[PDB]
Amino acid sequence: FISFEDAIKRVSKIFINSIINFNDLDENNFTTVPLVIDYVTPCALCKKRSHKHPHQLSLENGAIRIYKTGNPHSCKVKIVPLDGNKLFNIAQRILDTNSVLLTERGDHIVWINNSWKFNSEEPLITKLILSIRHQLPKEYSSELLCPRKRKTVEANIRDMLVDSVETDTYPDKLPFKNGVLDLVDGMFYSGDDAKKYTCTVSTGFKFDDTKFVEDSPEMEELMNIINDIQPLTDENKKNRELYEKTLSSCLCGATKGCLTFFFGETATGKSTTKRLLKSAIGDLFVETGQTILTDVLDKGPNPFIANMHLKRSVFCSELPDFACSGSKKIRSDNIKKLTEPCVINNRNHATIIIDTNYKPVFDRIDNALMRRIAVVRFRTHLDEGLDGKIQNNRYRFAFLYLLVKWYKKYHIPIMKLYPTPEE
């Protein structure tokens, strides 16, 4: 414990008025002799006026309790506990809420405004400490108004954070900016219910259940359009399944090691499906050109190699015909070395998908390439209103309903894609 003198100073500071029998207090009889207070001013415990009964002190659990002789309800009980630091207690309470966590990347993640955010050049921990002050007891609330004390608490939190956790573990949840949508049934967690899902990315827009309903003409005419695209024709009977699967696998969060090519001719809505998918996903969807697939990505700078970090799906199109002499064909070494689960902590789950109008040619072919080639084609050959529908983006949720249904049909049983070595 601490020296007795500090305890006497603390109890004397607690009582505003002076003590007349202070000299009688010793280290061996400080719990028996009553203390008489010169009541010139009301005591801090209860205002009243001129208490007529002496108080007394008791020692329990390393704490000194002051109780007034006689009726207990006259004077409020006061406790001088825990000879030690208070800011350490505040740091412990803040850490007990699991609001700040440490990742293997070397930085910290903080839960603010119903969102997990990490950023190494701003003081997020101090903002969290200021924000969470309401959940703490009253006496701890006024202690956090000084920035220096906030810095001390932040230092204590940093020191007591040794273990490291890994974020973005569940591939079966799609995050929003205000919650997380789930693939098991299609209902939207909001608020603290989504806290357990350590998601550091977002789609960039709200989710609203009003457009996520089934009885409306919008998605009826949406299946009208897609039947104009992919009719229930025998020629499409083999295509449809795989096609649907691919679209649903656009939503998956696991690593993708299988390529997917779409073959067709001009004016065949292949570019339209890009817009339907991108409107349905948002910022996670990313485009790419032919610069990176035919060039070595491990030589020289490559911003795309840094960019695909936690991207959801990547789309490659407008490929020039590689059959021309002097045109540099694709490099299959690249297509091997992005299919790995990681391309320097390059967590990668973006589904590669390609729309091409030409038959691909490979410099060298073995079993490995054909084991991971999948092909799908579209069958029909103009409605410009749906183009406006896409530009103003009222067709998102009606489409994600189709993705969720297809995910139920195919991907919930197993996360696997079946390629077609045939071409």
Binding site: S58, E60, H73, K76, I79, P81, N89, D96, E139, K196
Partner: protein
């Protein structure tokens, strides 16, 4: 795991400080086992009895609810009592949730939800003393987790300053622990007993050895 196995028989010691040899032989005058209805009938017929709740075998079934007791020797008014108990619940729940997430590997949010869902309160007939036992209905745990949690709760009790928190008696997390049955006399010549609360009118919610997973 346990699944079908759900404890429903109430094991009772009829006198504090039972001899060990009598316990091993199941002495009818010191060791007994009732049901819920049998126990309430036995309590009703004999108001002067002294019954004390404990387990029988700890090496086979050790699934119990999370129990602590509090005792201040100071009477308090109503509103401060409500504030003190609310701060007590929030602190204890947050602490045990952190412990479960760290050492037990559980998930924080469901623990806090289950523990804040339902809880029972007791009271003492004494006018100068405030003692009560709280038991959490929808939380289940073994003995070793409790003795590990003992150290955590003791630093929590030292660390806090709320009057209700400082009275956490940490010794009740020991082997072969016993707890006084509510509504039953402690001493043969003592009139101080425990009383129920309007939220809960059933004795099954006041016994920690009763296990019923919903």
């Amino acid at each position: 795991d346990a699944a079908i196995r759900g404890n429903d028989v109430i094991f009772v010691l009829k006198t504090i400080g039972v001899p060990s040899a009598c316990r091993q032989n199941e002495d009818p005058r010191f060791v007994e086992a009732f049901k819920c209805d049998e126990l309430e009938r036995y309590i009703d017929n004999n108001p002067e009895c002294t019954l004390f709740e404990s387990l029988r075998d700890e090496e086979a079934y050790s699934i119990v609810r999370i129990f602590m007791d509090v005792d201040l020797d100071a009477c308090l008014d109503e509103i401060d009592y409500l504030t003190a108990i609310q701060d007590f619940i929030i602190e204890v729940s947050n602490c045990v949730a952190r412990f479960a997430f760290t050492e037990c590997g559980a998930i924080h949010e469901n623990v806090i939800k289950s523990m804040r869902s339902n809880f029972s309160l007791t009271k003492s007939t004494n006018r100068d003393k405030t003692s009560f036992h709280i038991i959490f209905l929808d939380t289940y745990t073994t003995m070793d987790t409790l003795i590990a949690m003992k150290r955590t709760l003791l630093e929590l009790s030292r660390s806090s300053e709320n009057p209700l928190t400082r009275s956490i008696d940490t010794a009740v997390y020991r082997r072969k622990t016993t707890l006084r049955v509510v509504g039953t006399r402690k001493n043969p010549n003592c009139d101080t007993i425990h009383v129920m609360q309007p939220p809960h009118d059933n004795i099954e919610d006041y016994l920690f050895t009763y296990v019923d997973m919903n």
